[PDB]
């Protein structure tokens, strides 16, 4: 069992990115992991200080399951899975293409853009709202990249006990 939460004060006001999301094992707050949401019409996980702890179950992110769970994906199957894997490989914090440094982004801005790039595929939603031109440039690079991804990178899905809340995803390497 995991809890998922937003860390509303993680980034400064100028990054316009409060909904930085993490998951944590309920049996251990020694470690937390960065994750990204999908199904944006649902509610974000509650803030870390909330008296409401939003619980999640992890599941292997197969193409079939991912597509089934996405409410309005832009593409389906392997293409949806691989498109998202690549965004994460190229986004915060993997940064495989050096996009962060190229556009002189802060950590918060880069993570925000990675989230927006995920939504482009999972939710058919490319939001440019409140972005600077360099952020728009970075986001467009991120969503249009076609670099090869490592062959052993896989998707983890996190499904909330309560369907009111957003689904979450992360990646890992099979070693």
Numbering used by the authors: 102 to 276
From the article:
The only fully conserved residues, the thioester-forming Cys and Gln, are found in a [YFL]CΦζ motif (where Φ is any hydrophobic and ζ any hydrophilic residue) and a weak ΦQζΦΦ motif, respectively. Both motifs are consistently predicted to reside in a β-sheet secondary structure context.
